Structure 1
């Protein structure tokens, strides 16, 4: 007989994710030199809804240590973090909500 439903899901025809509206992938900073020897400051610029996600995202922007420009990251917001807050990422950083630590 027929191919049952849970076998058709794998080919992802009508079955792929509905993606058009999502903010982007949520990811920590690339574990570069700053973050693994010291820390680096950022600012959450916006905390924002991601379609089809439970929890809001936080756009957090940092300085490029190697070029003159702003590189913006997408975090999943922890409860409490706020627009304007300063976020610290790095080995030698301090232990408050929002920061990112090994």
Structure 2
């Protein structure tokens, strides 16, 4: 008869992100005339750590084409990008690591990152460290580019959507065991209050569907219907299957 923890997270009282030390939202440049028709050159001034993020961020300074001033942008640094490097962004920029290109302007097989889902959204896909998007083909009529996402899903995106050539820096991060509750603590201290996790089966029935009983056990199937309501969606929500995965992935 009590509101469960995953229900309480939605209120965002103690579950908001700890954003104080963050460098700012990591976004591509606003899709403007310069990027739509030619290219614009910026300079990588700093490669800096972002609190709560595995991948480093790149501060790239461009010139404002309409007013005399500098515009600093916060890109997600791709591996191999260095300070003092010239970044070129636009339809006419070259196929070099760190450059921002429309997906249609790159050949099949190109590896991009910080890929826009829609043109002008300033980057949605393949933003985490070591992640990348593979261009697998173009549909020049009704211009669309087929891409493979880090999850392996195939997506059809507008050919005007932009991405950064290369792979997001900081790859191999999850290969190192955290080795310590303290290291997990410091990891999540700068992301959000989602750790540590009490098992629902170790709670009382009032606190969780898995709570109670003279032994710790679920009692009913942990696979929960997609049509279940809040307070019921604990366990494996809308699971197609369960158990140890054996064989090959990528069903088709």
Q: TM-score, normalised by structure 1?
A: 0.99
Q: Which 5+ residue runs of structure 2 have no aligned equivalent?
A: 103-252
Matched, 1:66 2:66: yes
Task: Supply the distance in 1 between the matched residues of 2:29 and 2:86 (Cα, whole angstroms).
Answer: 15
CA offsets 1:19-63 (integer angstroms, 9 cap, x no match): 110000000000000001000100000001000101000000000
- Find the residue that maps to 1:58 and give its secondary structure: strand
Task: Supply the distance in 1 between the matched residues of 2:93 and 2:7 (Cα, whole angstroms).
Answer: 48
- Find the residue that maps to 1:62 and give its secondary structure: strand
- Give how far 1:93 is off: 1.0
Output the aligned Cα RMSD: 0.4
- Find the residue that maps to 1:6 and give its secondary structure: helix
CA offsets 1:47-89 (integer angstroms, 9 cap, x no match): 0100010100000000000000001000000000000000000
1:1-102 equivalences in 2 (<5 Å): 1-102=1-102
- Give how far 1:3 is off: 0.5
The count of corresponding residues between Structure 1 and Structure 2 is 102
- Give how far 1:95 is off: 0.1
Task: Supply the distance in 2 between the matched residues of 1:93 and 1:57 (Cα, whole angstroms).
Answer: 21
Task: Supply the distance in 2 between the matched residues of 1:65 and 1:41 (Cα, whole angstroms).
Answer: 11
- Find the residue that maps to 1:9 and give its secondary structure: helix
